[PDB]
RNA sequence: UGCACUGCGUAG
RNA sequence: CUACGCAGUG
RNA sequence: UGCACUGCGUAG
RNA sequence: CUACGCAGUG
């Protein structure tokens, strides 16, 4: 009605990416498991995820037995569906 | 057995303890555990805390349990209390209507209040006219503000009727505005709060009016969402072409901030690339779980980690040192100091302790009457506002911040900016709120923990704004001595000694203290920060109108308090607590621990029997203190004249930006009279949240010795031409590191460490005289490495080697 | 002294790491950090020791 | 234990000198080979750590 | 109190203490000392040597004085008392001529001549007609040879007139023939020594006689310059060109030899080759003062210095070995086995150790009764000369020496030469002279010790040569079980057992015995050395004649015990002991070590007072060994037969070519009438010139245990279907060490990993009966290893890590 | 006379060039301090001094103040005079 | 690669 | 006094 | 980069 | 039995 709207929630709403930081594997299952997700009441389909050294980590190779050998954090990079 | 009372009467007046269907325990017990809190004694709180299912007992087994750094859990278990607090409020609510039904006239205490809520105290009430019923309640409400942060008292009203089980209400994302929700807040919990509340302090009539308000507001917002908050934007038309700027603010403390000159050249330029907004809008969404702290948007496409590079070693220095017998099997000095190398995620995880800061709610009318007595020790100085080109720049090659930095450094603004154009953009700063960004930097540095440490690097125009607005007071404090505040006295020449003096002046039986701010930087609360701006802001009397000095202040919130901080390629919002790249980081931090200290003399008075009190003058102070506390409104000049002597003659105080050293009388501080550590430490608590240890703390007997530590040097008494004087020296191990370890190897070896060998010996000259042989043999062995030196690149010169040049340094003849 | 020249080897020992580029590998930068840290705050002479020899062969190891 | 992967560690060191063209200078041969050979009969911790700490600092000197 | 008496008669008859102006102490004392020497009991020796000033009081107080290796010094003082021996001699000749003067017969005995040299003793003389005087001096001068070469009495005759004082005799340097000087010598000091003595041993009646007269030829050659030794050469024209070739040798024990087919094809290209003559005139002249040893001359232009390098380093079996819990702190299983490394001058340090050989005479009748005694422990093999087509060669790849490495390998050389070919060469040797260069290698093995380890890389004819010598006897030996020589007895299946019940047989009251050489292969002297080839080729009685086994003997002499030495590109003269790549090293170390025990024997049995002796039969045994030793020329066939059988009675011997482990009975060596371990401590010290320390000899009074260690190996009685047997085991850490660390990289890892770790493994097994577990948990840990090794990698390879295979290998089925 | 002679005195009486190995300074000056000097009854003069790595070292490098800069043993090549 | 204070060194 | 560089303090 | 002894593994 | 390789012992 005023036209005025909070900084903050202008990327909620207008973001076509989202980049997502994961300390750790439980987070990880906590928040973005699956190839999709949902955050910020909007589902994200996951593209990329990269590790803090810049490769290319798979999807197959994240996982409990594998995660001791991925160099945490992860970013992950999805686009909105 | 001892019960917390509030009393007030001719014979006596304070809240202390006494000897003297109804629960064991009353809100005022609870208040002065809160509020009065010694790990030796906790009898009180932890009995309250499980009688009504807070914890268990096997909780207070663990150590630490109080400390909020070490275990933070302790903050759930206090929030467990919250609920009863807030019911507690209600029915007092209740209470005074009926009273107020009953024409009954009468003053409601904390402790005739039972911790389930029940009113049970039926005197000092006078029946009057039915419907004119007044009660006083400005103690009961002053004293229990501190608890309701604390256990966060007001949570339920997250939720949809105010009901914890039920779903949390889900505001409008594009929501700003809670006006409204304010006064119902107000209404409903502090009806009978006679003082008129404004949720937007663009409408408070002074300063206290301000300060008033926005204590109401932290309470207040902790139930807003926090996506709320922030800077407001809107999206306009600009030479034909969209452009998303800001034209508002809100503030957790402050409300809603309207932009005057909104409107739909190079100020305009800076003003828009300073904005967060189109960075924000421009920027990809970002959810980091690293930290607790909220997460606004990505900048870069990949993340950005920052690593510590390790500290040079200098191999010619440690060779002469072991060569000459330092360095050895059991000795005394030892390498203490080194440059602790960190991992890509130290600067963030530095970050991550910002979740130490905490909405705090202050105790209103003890803030008002602590801000009073403060003013009183800067009002030697003079202040105001001055043009562009009476602002002296120390260096101009250092970063402009976020975007400035990627174009250049604060010189080319500098020189880009015509006086005309920092004259304009300062008016514009006094009509306006233009939010910035904060880079964090890791500062690369010796130290003798490992911990990381960032310092906040502000864009160049509010650097530039604040420059103009305070820079007059900043340079009055830094030119004047014998003041409390020993900001820009030097050490040298006898400063050390006229310092010490001073402090020590007419105290009849002087002990000494120094403490420490744990997390000062980061857990000082946002209502002690505004209190210090408006206490800087005070000197603009005459240059500054109302208006004019509020948009400073929001300017200086928006950008120092509740900025937008740049960590990394990510923009995150700071909870709050204090930039140590401001213009007034020291001085605000002067004014926080001066603030701090009148504060704990003041609850060490009133938490006083009194009647035990054989001194008539010390209790009608006391007696007054409680009068112009939570009783009268207006301030009490000649009381606080009274207070700021007593202070002084009792109370003698040297501060430097977070580094206090006290002379106290023995007699006032052993009855109470005085403040004690246990004081500071109780203040801490309940107004910093944080604990304070008693290791980081000193005391020391004898003035003889001196200050145990102050700015990281001790002291020594040593006689000089037939006169004794006090000498600062450093500890051993901090200099030789410095002289082993170097940042870059640059400065590995050449010319360029003859000056720093210089400086060092000129600082570690002073050990000579220490009894301990090896303290004094580090300056022989800095003098004999610097002769190596001049030797290895081979009149006046010789001075370097010979110890004249550094006697002379110390002598109060300049 | 041991401990002393323990640590200086150590503290260039970093140096020479982080000049070989080490810092690119996050998870073999953040072992050296750690043990390095540890020697720089080590009281106990065996243990100083005993992670100068880990990050020394961490070195050899390249 | 430290004492048998210090010897160890001197082992390898050493093999990695001679691999170096250490042996070219005589009496940085003699030194190495004299430390190593200490090392290896040494009975006490502290003088084998002593010992390899000063032929790997004989490495990283070139 | 007691004195050191020679005593012969019916009822007694021995060298040996007795309760019985002139001087304090007889030369028979002096010769008791020096021949029966006990760190404990020194005070004889010790007061002769301060009375005569050979040295100071002070000099006892330091501690390992007696000891040649640890002091060398001790040879100087010993050296201050030859003088007077030398006196003595000349005055011992001079009483002889006035006896004979006077028609005395009489016989001479050290007890009765002091330490002045003065004859007191008038006693047991006859008188008979004037010049007929015959006097007895066998006992007298065989007794007192040892002593003359340890004190170097005939130092004064190599000095001008025969005195000290007076400049060194100056010899023409082309002169090498010293016939006449020898029968000076021996007419002015051995006057009336009965025997013939031949200074050239060409021409020696037999075995017998040859070791008389290198025993005096070795104390005669000590006078004579060493230059003036060596082969003999001369200039030649051949084939109209002119060379230079050896024609003779000039050896300190055998004299001067020359070549019967001297004149002025394949088989005389290696003759030449292999001559040094050529090479060292050729070569340039060297003064190398790393080392007391002659220097000859470089055949390079620049010195070469060898290094050792490190081991490597098995990093995946360290790692499987401390991952299985292994290698802890305070286990008792340790690693003390390694690859040391060498720096550049360790070979010629090596060599240096050759220092410690020293010019020894032995007592020749003692040396004459030894030999014989010991021929019988080489009676049941037999041996003789074989042609080329029956000589068999282990490894045709191995190095054919010095020039020969140059071209090839033995195989080249082997092939090059067709059997008629050898069979010539062989026919040659047995004629003329060879002389050869051996070459020194340092050994790259494990060891506990830094010391390095060099061997003697002989040329191809001398190994040829010898082969075809020797090879007959030597498989004989080796195919020979139950003899005290136990060359060729495998350890496994059951042979270990074997062995030692064939030691302990028929002993009454057995304890045993194990005895070390210090510095065996460098200090042992020649004579022992030339008895041993002498027994060796007395199996070469049909088949060679008199001069054939002379020039045979020659021709080792010249190629093992005094050859010429290549190191480092230079050329040196070994002063003496044996080579370690002989064909006959072990045999002769052998033969050296019967020889040894045997001489303690019988110093053992003639030490007994015999008057205490209780028994018969061993005082009839005791006066007839006296009788056969200074009385009776011809050997005594029963005499030697039955001391043969007395000795395998009461002393049963296991001898492996150093190594020894004797069964002696319990109260004959209570008594003295067997050999204990201070009797072979005395006869290393006069014959071997070396001290033997108690720590590396060792005692068990208890069978059951077993010897303490055998070739490295301890021995445990364990229990294996139904019986009880002996078992060897090695040292944990030296199986360890060799599995940790490797020769060469190339054996790091793969398939040829699985032999060295089933070897291992094999030899380790027996530590599983250890009652130590870590000593078991080896040998799993072994075969696990194994196991990972094959997974690696990837039925009858199960075998490998099933133990059944090592059990298999340890039983007496095969 | 007979014309045969020792093989170890012929390159002592015959050889034109000589090297003497020196392990340490003390055998240096006793031996061969000077530029010349007398062995087996000759008169040598050097030629040359190398060290144990096959360095030229000089003459005026030997002394006692140098000596622990030297690669020890040095070799001296001598011409008879 | 921040805001202040203090003290040194080199040119004017 | 100004320009540059260095060192210490919060 | 030596002389012997012993025991293993791969082809015949 | 022979050829090759390996391990241990003196
Ligand atoms: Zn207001
Ligand atoms: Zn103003
Ligand atoms: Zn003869
Ligand atoms: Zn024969």
Redo the contacts with the bound molecule.
């Keep these: 009605r005023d036209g005025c709207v909070p900084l903050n929630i202008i990327p909620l709403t207008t973001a076509a990416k989202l980049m997502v930081v994961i300390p750790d594997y439980n987070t990880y299952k906590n928040t973005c498991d699956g190839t999709t997700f949902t955050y910020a009441s909007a589902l994200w389909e996951i593209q990329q995820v990269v590790d803090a050294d810049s490769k290319i980590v798979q999807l197959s190779e994240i996982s409990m037995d594998n995660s001791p050998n991925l160099a945490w954090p992860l970013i992950v990079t999805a686009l909105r569906a | 057995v001892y019960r917390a009372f509030d009393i007030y009467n001719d014979k006596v007046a304070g809240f202390a303890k006494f000897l003297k269907r109804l629960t064991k325990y009353t809100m005022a017990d609870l208040v002065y555990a809160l509020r009065h809190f010694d790990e030796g004694n906790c009898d009180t709180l932890k009995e309250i805390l499980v009688t009504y299912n807070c914890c268990d007992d096997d909780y207070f087994n663990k150590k630490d349990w109080y400390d909020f750094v070490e275990n933070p859990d302790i903050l759930r278990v206090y929030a467990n209390l919250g609920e009863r607090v807030r019911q507690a409020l209600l029915k007092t609510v209740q209470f005074c209507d009926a009273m107020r039904n009953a024409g009954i006239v009468g003053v409601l205490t904390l402790d005739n209040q039972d911790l389930n809520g029940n009113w049970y105290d039926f005197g000092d009430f006078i029946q009057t006219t039915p419907g004119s019923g007044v009660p006083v309640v400005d103690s009961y409400y002053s004293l229990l503000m501190p608890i309701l942060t604390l256990t966060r008292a007001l949570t339920a009203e997250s939720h949809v009727d105010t009901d914890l089980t039920k779903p949390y209400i889900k505001w409008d994302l594009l929501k700003y505005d809670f006006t409204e929700e304010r006064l119902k807040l107000f209404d409903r919990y502090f009806k009978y709060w006679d003082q008129t509340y404004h949720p937007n302090c663009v409408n408070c009539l002074d300063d206290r009016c301000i300060l008033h308000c926005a204590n109401f507001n932290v309470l207040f917002s902790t139930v807003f969402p926090p996506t709320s908050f922030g800077p407001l934007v809107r999206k306009i038309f600009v030479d034909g072409v969209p452009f998303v700027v800001s034209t508002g603010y809100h503030f957790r403390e402050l409300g809603v901030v309207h932009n005057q000159d909104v409107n739909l050249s190079f100020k305009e330029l800076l003003v828009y690339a300073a904005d967060p907004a189109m960075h924000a809008a421009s920027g990809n969404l970002l959810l980091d779980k690293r930290t607790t702290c909220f997460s606004v948007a990505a900048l870069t496409n990949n993340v950005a980690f920052q690593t510590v590079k390790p500290g040079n070693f200098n191999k010619d220095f440690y060779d002469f040192a072991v060569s000459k017998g330092f360095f050895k099997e059991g000795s005394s000095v030892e390498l203490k100091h080194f440059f602790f190398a960190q991992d890509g995620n130290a600067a963030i995880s530095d970050y991550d302790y910002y979740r130490y800061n905490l909405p705090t709610m202050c105790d209103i009318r003890q803030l008002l009457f602590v801000v009073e007595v403060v003013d009183k020790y800067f009002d030697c100085y003079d202040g105001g506002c001055i043009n562009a080109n009476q602002v ?8 402009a ?2 975007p400035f ?1 990627k174009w250049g450094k ?1 010189r080319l603004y500098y020189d880009s900016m015509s006086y005309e154009d920092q004259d304009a953009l300062f008016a514009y700063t006094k009509r306006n709120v233009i939010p910035t960004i904060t ?1 964090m ?1 890791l ?4 130290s003798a923990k490992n911990r990381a440490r960032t ?4 864009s160049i125009c509010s ?1 530039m704004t604040n ?1 103009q607005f305070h ?1 007059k007071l ?2 009055s404090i ?2 004047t001595r014998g003041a409390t505040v020993v ?7 006898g400063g050390w000694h006229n310092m010490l003096k001073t402090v020590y002046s007419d105290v009849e039986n002087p002990h000494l203290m120094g403490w420490d701010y744990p997390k000062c930087d980061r857990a000082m609360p946002n209502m002690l920060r505004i209190m210090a701006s408006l206490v800087l802001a005070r000197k603009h009397t005459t240059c500054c109108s109302l208006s004019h000095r509020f948009y400073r202040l929001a300017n200086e919130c928006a950008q120092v308090l509740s900025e937008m901080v740049m960590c990394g390629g990510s923009l995150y919002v700071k909870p709050g607590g204090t930039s ?7 001085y605000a ?1 002067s004014v926080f621990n001066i603030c701090q200290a009148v504060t704990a003399n003041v609850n060490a008075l009133l938490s006083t029997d009194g009647n035990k009190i054989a001194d008539k003058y010390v209790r009608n102070l006391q007696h007054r203190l409680y009068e112009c506390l939570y009783r009268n409104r207006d301030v009490d000049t000649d009381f606080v004249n009274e207070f700021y002597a007593y202070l002084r003659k009792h109370f003698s105080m040297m501060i ?4 206090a050293v006290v002379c106290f009388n023995s007699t006032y501080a052993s009855q109470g009279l005085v403040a004690s550590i246990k004081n500071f430490k109780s203040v801490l608590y309940y107004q910093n949240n944080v604990f304070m240890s008693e290791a980081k703390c000193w005391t020391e007997t004898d003035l003889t010795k001196g200050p145990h530590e102050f ?3 001790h002291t020594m008494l040593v006689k000089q031409g037939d006169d004794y004087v006090y000498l600062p020296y ?1 500890d051993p191990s ?2 030789l590191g ?1 002289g082993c370890f ?2 870059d190897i640059v ?1 590995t070896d050449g010319t ?1 460490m ?3 060998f ?3 010996a ?2 570690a000259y002073p050990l000579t005289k220490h009894p301990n042989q090896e303290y004094a043999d580090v300056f022989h062995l800095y003098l004999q490495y610097i002769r190596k030196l001049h030797d290895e690149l081979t009149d ?1 010169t010789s ?1 370097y080697w010979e110890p004249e ?1 550094y006697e002379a ?1 110390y002598t109060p003849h ?1 | 002294s041991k401990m002393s020249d323990v640590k200086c080897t150590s503290v260039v020992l970093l140096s020479v790491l982080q000049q070989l580029r080490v810092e690119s590998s996050s998870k073999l930068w953040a072992q050296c950090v750690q043990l390095h840290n540890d020697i720089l705050l080590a009281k106990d002479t065996t243990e100083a020791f005993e992670k100068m020899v880990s990050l020394l062969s961490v070195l050899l190891s390249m």
Aim: proline fraction near 1%; charged fraction near 20%.
């Design positions: 002296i720049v120390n260096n101009l090659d250092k970063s911040g976020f930095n604060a880079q930097n500062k690369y540095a010796i310092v906040a690097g502000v650097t420059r820079q900043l340079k830094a030119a900001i820009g006295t030097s050490k040298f020449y140590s790249g401001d213009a007034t980081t020291a931090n430097l930006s977070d580094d700015c990281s040097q450093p901090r200099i410095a170097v940042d400065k360029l003859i000056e720093r210089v400086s060092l000129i600082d006046n001075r040049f340094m300049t």
